Design a protein around this ligand. Sequence first.
Ligand SMILES: O=P(O)(O)O[C@H]1[C@H](OP(=O)(O)O)[C@H](OP(=O)(O)O)[C@H](OP(=O)(O)O)[C@@H](OP(=O)(O)O)[C@H]1OP(=O)(O)O
Lengths: 218, 138, 161, 56, 73, 123, 36, 176
Amino acid sequence: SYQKLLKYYVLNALKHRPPKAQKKRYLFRSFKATKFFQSTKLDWVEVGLQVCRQGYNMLNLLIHRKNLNYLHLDYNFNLKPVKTLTTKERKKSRFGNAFHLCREVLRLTKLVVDSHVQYRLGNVDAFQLADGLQYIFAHVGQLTGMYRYKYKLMRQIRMCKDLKHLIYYRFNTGPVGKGPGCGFWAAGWRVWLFFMRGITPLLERWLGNLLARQFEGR
Amino acid sequence: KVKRSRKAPPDGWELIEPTLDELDQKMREAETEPHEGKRKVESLWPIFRIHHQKTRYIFDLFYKRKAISRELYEYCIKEGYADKNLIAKWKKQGYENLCCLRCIQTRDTNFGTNCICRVPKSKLEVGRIIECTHCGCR
Amino acid sequence: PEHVRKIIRDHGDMTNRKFRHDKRVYLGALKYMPHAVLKLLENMPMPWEQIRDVPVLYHITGAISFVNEIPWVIEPVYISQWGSMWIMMRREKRDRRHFKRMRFPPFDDEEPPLDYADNILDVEPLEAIQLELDPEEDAPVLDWFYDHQPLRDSRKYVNGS
Amino acid sequence: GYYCNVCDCVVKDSINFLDHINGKKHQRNLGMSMRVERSTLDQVKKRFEVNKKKME
Amino acid sequence: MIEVVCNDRLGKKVRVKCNTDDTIGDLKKLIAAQTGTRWNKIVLKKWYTIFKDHVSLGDYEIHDGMNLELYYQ
Amino acid sequence: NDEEEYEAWKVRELKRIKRDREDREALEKEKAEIERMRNLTEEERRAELRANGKVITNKAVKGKYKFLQKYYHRGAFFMDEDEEVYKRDFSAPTLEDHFNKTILPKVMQVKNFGRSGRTKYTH
Amino acid sequence: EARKRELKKNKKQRMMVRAAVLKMKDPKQIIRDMEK
Amino acid sequence: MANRTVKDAHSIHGTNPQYLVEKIIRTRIYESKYWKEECFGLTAELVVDKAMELRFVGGVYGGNIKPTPFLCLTLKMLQIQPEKDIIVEFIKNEDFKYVRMLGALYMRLTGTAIDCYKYLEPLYNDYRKIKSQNRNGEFELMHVDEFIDELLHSERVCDIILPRLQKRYVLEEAEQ
RNA sequence: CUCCGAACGGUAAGAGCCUAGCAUGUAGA
RNA sequence: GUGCUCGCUUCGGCAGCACAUAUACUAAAAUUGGAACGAUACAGAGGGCCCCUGCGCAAGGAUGA
RNA sequence: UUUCUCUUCAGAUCGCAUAAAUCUUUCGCCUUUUACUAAAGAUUUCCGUGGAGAGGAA
Ligand SMILES: O=P(O)(O)O[C@H]1[C@H](OP(=O)(O)O)[C@H](OP(=O)(O)O)[C@H](OP(=O)(O)O)[C@@H](OP(=O)(O)O)[C@H]1OP(=O)(O)O
């Protein structure tokens, strides 16, 4: 684990050239100038639930525009069939690339949001919360089905799995020797933040390429 | 809408409770109201009316009546009950009373950013019809 | 403030509530500019002060509530916070025998939780792992340590808003 | 198998035929039978008469 | 002990490790533990050969790798 | 059996009424149990008192993978139930781990024409 | 590997020929005209 | 046609007008033998006749998803969307049982939580019997108190998922 | 000695009967 | 609506002063008609263009001049 | 005194750390491709950041 962490660290140290470009291009700074945006002060859990509902609504309207009346996401973003579409329909729902990935990403997001909603809605409410978050990053390593759209995940997932045992042998030392150490997401959440920050433009490009095919032509 | 502030309220908070919570109950009723009947945005008029009433009350208490202290005139806005920028808009001589933007000219927003009642009483309301898409401030 | 919630009243309908006219880019920008998963992946409410504010830019039709806020946690205060949390989590793992933290899927298989916490939200236990500090040695780091923005009304330790 | 008189068609199955007259074009031509929500007293009579006939 | 592939062409290619002489209720428990759906809602098929919640596993004689088209109730 | 029905209607009403009050006091009992554990952690005994069980919902009684037996993930989606189907010691050869994987010539990870990965925990 | 594509092309041609044969003298083409 | 009630519907703010039930189970209700009969139209009156003639309280059975006429008729009344007066009349009906059961169920799925408690509390005194079909087809005799206990306290008392009704503590702290 | 992967290369093509969630909002007299 | 005329002239008001100057795919509506390779019955295989899946002018599968 | 607007110049570990993509080379694979593996070089995209006019609240 420490070997892999040091490997990532040194490989980061190498690819480090002084960046000076882009002319200071900022987003969410010109949107508010137009009438397609309005600022507000809304609680964080509210914003998360709003984002999850908006994502589900977007995907549902996508699937409905395609006139597929036999599929369902189920609000955990696990695309569920209905009646064994196998005449000519299973060849019509072979997304593979972006629907898979957007589904995985929104599944992770809605999962974290609903975990904190249960915290506010009377969960364990103790350190069990942070333990759950640690298990959630483990699940994003394994449970969340993002492998197919991108296999480069395994780098950061091995990073998270090594970061795991980096903590327990610093946390589970002394009285706590075997039990589940709830740990922290000081590094996990950090890595996934960097990940999403780097991969936002890929999905911007894929949606720019796909929306024209489902809304303009081919 | 009282959720939390990580501290105790000021001394003169007990006087604010009944009227403030009455207005908050009106807001909660207008928030869970039905959509059937509201044409396109008719549901979003009374929310602005209630917000205007709340700002009116807290402003009359702040220094119009000189009843509320200096802590409440910042702590009531520090926690979410009224708008500071809106009251700053009220400080002007022209901005007497109007909504956010429903009859304004081309402001920073493509439709408007000045006020709902910003139109004049002597020339607006073309012919006889007075209305406003954002707040209906005739 | 509450314009957002009434803007969420429409989830899909037959031209009932802004369904037809407010659909096409309501899908487009919804799928094209996610840019909120990152913000929610970058605007954790800091559970020691889990009452976060989270300013949110929202499209009018209700496409996405984008967050404009950015975290600027002070490095040494940040590290002291997470170290106190480290000690308290070790304490709670040592003392407690039976540890229930296995609520892995929430939302209950197509049960949207948008109720009783997307509302007035009477429940708010924001006193999770706030360590009880004795003001004898921990005095100067007392009143600016259990607040997620300990710089607003400072005027000496904060360059601005 | 099943054959309709007004619909002017024949279905070679049971469930496939059951899903025919319930929303048929000729069934629609026979008359618009949109469910009109009866008055509150309608349920009252539907309860009273059925309690008096079936039970009593 | 047996390894089964609870598969599907809709983002669910799951690998559950089932017992030898076990039932299918426990297999559905494992499929839910690895898939993320309620227990009683899962369905397993192989061209409409709907496996039931009481017929055992060795009864059909499943062996290592026998994939199963997953569906939901 | 009307006399028996009214007798059990209170039997259910008592349990259902007992669950309500038992749920309210549990929030105070949980906080009180932390307070009892607080003083217990404070001045009960310096490594001279446990009053515990180290209870865990599902004990993962693991074994030892032979040489390259796959890392099987149980799946952390349902563990509060404490179902007995989980306690089975998933440390067995599933499909191809039955072999020794030592008599082989040099090594065989997978000849499926996809060996992107390269690792065996040698270092 | 290309033999699969060749067989697929041959099968597609045969299917098109069979469809044309069934449609040219179809019940809607031949037997339908038999009544006229 | 099985889209809307007549021409318009006050959309239940939870999920949707008709889609409060899972889409899978809904599509199964449509592709069903019982959906053939009584689906020609049932607004307010004939629902009463079709309701009392089915003495079961259950959801899905069989290896395939087999909907009971109880569940299908709940969905029929859901698509019909009657007024609250009729539902209150059915809630206060002691002679017929399953009509009151359906009133309670639709009130749970269609109604504010305040009214849910206000109209479901007095159903906590019927120690009578209720017939219910298990998933394996076998029936079971269940008391009505147990039914409402699973309805309010527990989730998915039937195959349907419930839209997260509040805890009694918050409402007791705020209201009645 | 714990590194765990997904899609395509896959389901013959067929004539008779039948049922449906979706979409325009206007020019003009 | 706001503040003011050493105004008419009271504290009822009368007239004037200056600030504020034009939102709106207008309508909560109206009518308008169609498509599953979808289940069912039936015989049971010797060069480019128009389409579909799809992120790549990656790849894949297809009737209609 | 405090903030928001924006045209503008950055070679300061512009950011006491660290994401991806494109192209060109070198390995491992390889049944075709897309997803890939681990090393070098370069160009961009995203989370950003620094220093200088003018214009808007306390
Ligand atoms: O079973 P071990 O080989 O001893 O390792 C386990 C295992 O992690 P790894 O398999 O990746 O090494 C557990 O992870 P999961 O099986 O749950 O995925 C993890 O438990 P957590 O998930 O809570 O982190 C933790 O076990 P524990 O919680 O007891 O610390 C850990 O190390 P140990 O089992 O040796 O402690």
